[PDB]
Write a protein that holds these residues in place. Structure first.
Motif, mmCIF file in Angstrom:
data_model
loop_
_atom_site.group_PDB
_atom_site.id
_atom_site.type_symbol
_atom_site.label_atom_id
_atom_site.label_comp_id
_atom_site.label_asym_id
_atom_site.label_seq_id
_atom_site.Cartn_x
_atom_site.Cartn_y
_atom_site.Cartn_z
ATOM 1 N N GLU A 13 25.841 11.866 -28.643
ATOM 2 C CA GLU A 13 25.066 11.220 -27.978
ATOM 3 C C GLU A 13 24.455 10.020 -28.856
ATOM 4 O O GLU A 13 24.066 10.069 -29.837
ATOM 5 C CB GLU A 13 23.702 12.044 -27.429
ATOM 6 C CG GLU A 13 23.007 11.394 -26.145
ATOM 7 C CD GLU A 13 21.990 12.435 -25.538
ATOM 8 O OE1 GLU A 13 21.713 13.372 -26.186
ATOM 9 O OE2 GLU A 13 21.431 12.265 -24.330
ATOM 10 N N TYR B 104 22.202 5.845 -29.017
ATOM 11 C CA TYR B 104 21.131 5.088 -28.347
ATOM 12 C C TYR B 104 21.315 3.848 -29.114
ATOM 13 O O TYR B 104 21.664 3.808 -30.326
ATOM 14 C CB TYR B 104 19.681 5.595 -28.246
ATOM 15 C CG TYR B 104 19.676 6.796 -27.398
ATOM 16 C CD1 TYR B 104 19.772 8.278 -27.751
ATOM 17 C CD2 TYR B 104 18.906 6.781 -26.282
ATOM 18 C CE1 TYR B 104 19.605 9.284 -26.748
ATOM 19 C CE2 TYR B 104 18.768 7.650 -25.424
ATOM 20 C CZ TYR B 104 19.210 9.088 -25.494
ATOM 21 O OH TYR B 104 18.787 9.913 -24.927
ATOM 22 N N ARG C 147 22.222 4.428 -23.245
ATOM 23 C CA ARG C 147 22.557 5.684 -23.919
ATOM 24 C C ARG C 147 24.118 5.810 -23.525
ATOM 25 O O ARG C 147 24.538 5.341 -22.546
ATOM 26 C CB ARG C 147 21.548 6.732 -23.471
ATOM 27 C CG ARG C 147 22.158 7.337 -22.022
ATOM 28 C CD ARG C 147 20.844 8.476 -21.746
ATOM 29 N NE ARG C 147 20.974 9.638 -21.883
ATOM 30 C CZ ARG C 147 20.726 10.804 -21.483
ATOM 31 N NH1 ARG C 147 20.126 10.523 -20.204
ATOM 32 N NH2 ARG C 147 20.984 11.986 -21.858
ATOM 33 N N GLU D 4 13.562 7.944 -29.482
ATOM 34 C CA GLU D 4 14.921 8.583 -29.085
ATOM 35 C C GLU D 4 15.787 8.533 -29.930
ATOM 36 O O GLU D 4 16.050 7.778 -30.902
ATOM 37 C CB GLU D 4 15.432 7.801 -27.977
ATOM 38 C CG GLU D 4 14.448 7.603 -26.657
ATOM 39 C CD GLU D 4 14.361 9.149 -25.742
ATOM 40 O OE1 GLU D 4 15.157 9.967 -26.139
ATOM 41 O OE2 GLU D 4 13.620 9.076 -24.921
ATOM 42 N N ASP E 190 19.615 9.935 -31.786
ATOM 43 C CA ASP E 190 21.187 10.500 -31.521
ATOM 44 C C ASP E 190 21.649 11.653 -32.418
ATOM 45 O O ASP E 190 21.158 11.913 -33.346
ATOM 46 C CB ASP E 190 22.184 9.486 -32.066
ATOM 47 C CG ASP E 190 21.301 7.920 -32.197
ATOM 48 O OD1 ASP E 190 21.457 7.335 -33.275
ATOM 49 O OD2 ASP E 190 21.242 7.601 -30.874
#
Lengths: 156, 156, 156, 156
Positions: free
Chosen positions: C52, C54, C92, D89, D91
C-alpha cells in the motif's frame, strides 16, 4: 490452454500484416524479389476505468446559484458588517470504460529486397518509395513506438 | 504438472523466435549458412492493482465550490474580523488492473554466420545489416534489457 | 514424493540449458569437440505480498482539499489570532502479488573445449567468442550471481 | 519411515552431484583416472515467517496528512500560544513466507586424480583448471560454507 490461443492469435495477426506487405510490394520490385517478417506485442490484461469530472465555478459570471442570503449593516467612529451565504449547482460528467483484450502495443518490421538484374543496386528514390509503401501497409504509429528497417542486398 | 506446461510454452516461444530469425536471415547469407539460439524468461506470478487519483484544487480559478459562508466585520483603535467556510467537489479517477500470466521479461539471442566462399570474411556493412535485421526480427526492447550477439566464423 | 518431482524438474531445466549450449557451440569448434555441464538452484517456497502506497501532499500546490475553515482576528497594544482546519483527499495504490513456485535463483556453467588438430591451442579471440556465445546461450544475469568458466585442453 | 526417506533423498542428491562431477572431469584426465565423493546436509524443519514494514514519515516533505488543525495566538509584555494536531496516512508492506523442506545447507567434496603415465605428476595449471571445473560442477557457494579438496596421487 490460453497461452496457445494467444500465440496463434499473434501468429494470425503477424501473417495478415506480412501478407498485406507482400501484396503491396509485389507489383513493383517483382513477384519473388521481396521478403518480410513481422513481430507483434499484444496486451492481454483486464482493465477498467471510471472518471468523474466537475466544471469550475470560480467566476461569478458562470456560477449557478440556488439560494443566497446577504446581510449588510453600517453605522456612522465607523462600523461595517457583511454576512453572506451561498449554495451552488454544479455540472458533472461520469464516464465508464472497459478495455478490450488483445490489442497491439508495438510493431517491428524487417524487409529485404533483391538487386535489379538486367547485379545493379536500386536507386535511392526507389528505396524511399518502398519504405513509404511499407510504412503505409504496416500501419506505422510513432506514438506506439513502431520500428521499420529495409535492406537491399543481392539474393543467394 | 504446471512446471512442464511452463517449460513447453517457453520452448514454443523460443522456437517461434528462432524460426522467425532463420526465415529472415536465410535469403541473404544462404540457405544453411546461419544458426541461432534463443533463451527467454517468463513471468508466471499473479498480480492485481488498484489506483485512485485526485485532481488538486489549490488554485481558486480551478476549484469547484458547493457551499460557502463568509463573514466580515470592521470597527474603526482598529478592529478586523474575518470568518470563512468552504466545501468543495473534486474530480477522481479509479483504475483496476489484472495482469496476464506468461509475459516475456528478457531476451538473449546468439547468432553465428559462416564465411563467404568463392574462406573470405564478410564485410563490416554486411555484418551491420545482419545485426539490424536480427534486432528487427527478435523484437529488441532496451527497456526490457534484451541482449544480442552475432559472431562470424568459418563453419566446421 | 515432492522431492523427486523437484529433482526431475531441475534435471530437465539443466538438460535444456545443456542442449542449448551444445547446439549453439557445435557448428564452430566441431561436432564432438565440446562438453558442458549445468547446475541450477530453484526456489520452492510459497510467498505472498501486499503493498500500500500513498502520495505525499506536503505542498499546497498539489494538495486536494474537501472542507476548510479559516478564522482571522486582529485588534490594534497589538493582538492577533488565527485558526485553521483542513480536510484532505489522498491518492492511494494497492498491489497484491503471489509468486511462482520453481524459479531459478543461480546458475553455474562449466565448458571444456578441445585443441585444434591439423595439437594446437585455440586463439584468444576464438576463446572470447566462445565465452560470449556461451554467455548468450545460458542467459547470464549479473544480478542473479551467475558464474561461467571455460577451459581449453586437449581431449583424452 | 521418514528417516529412511530423508536418507535416500540425500543419497540421490549426492549421487547426482557425483555423476555431474565425474562427467565434467572425465574427458580431460581420462575415462577412469578420477574419483569423487560428496556428502550433503539437508534441512528438514518446518518454518513460517510473517513480516510487516512501515515507511518513516519524519520529514514533512514526504508525509501524507489527512486532517490538520492549527491555532495561533499572539498578544503584544509578550505572549505567544501555538496549538497543533495532525493525522497521518502511512505506507505498509506485509509478506508471508512458508519455507521448503529438504534444502541443502552445506557441501563437502573430495576429489582424487591419477598421475600422468607416458608416473609423472600433473602440472600446477592443470590442477588449477581441475579445481575450477569441480567448483563450477558442485555449485560452490561461499555463503553456504562449502568446502572442496583435490588431491593428485598415483593410483594403486
Amino acid at each position: 490452454d490460453l497461452n496457445d490461443a494467444q500465440l496463434k492469435f499473434a501468429n494470425d495477426v503477424e501473417s495478415r500484416i506480412q501478407r498485406r506487405i507482400e501484396a503491396i510490394l509485389s507489383p513493383i520490385v517483382g513477384n519473388g524479389n521481396v521478403h518480410a517478417q513481422v513481430t507483434a506485442q499484444l496486451d492481454f490484461a483486464n482493465k477498467e476505468q471510471t472518471e468523474e469530472h466537475y466544471s469550475p465555478n470560480g467566476d461569478a459570471s458562470k456560477a449557478t446559484l440556488r439560494s443566497r442570503q446577504l446581510n449588510i449593516s453600517e453605522q456612522v467612529p465607523r462600523s461595517t458588517q457583511r454576512n453572506e451565504t451561498s449554495n451552488y449547482e454544479v455540472d458533472r460528467t461520469i464516464r465508464h470504460t472497459k478495455m478490450n483484450v488483445g490489442d497491439i502495443e508495438r510493431l517491428s518490421v524487417a524487409v529485404v529486397v533483391n538487386y535489379k538484374t538486367l547485379p545493379l543496386p536500386l536507386t535511392a528514390d526507389q528505396m524511399k518509395q518502398i519504405e513509404d509503401l511499407t510504412r503505409e501497409a504496416m500501419g506505422f504509429s510513432d506514438k506506439r513506438g513502431d520500428t521499420l528497417n529495409v535492406v537491399n542486398s543481392p539474393f543467394s
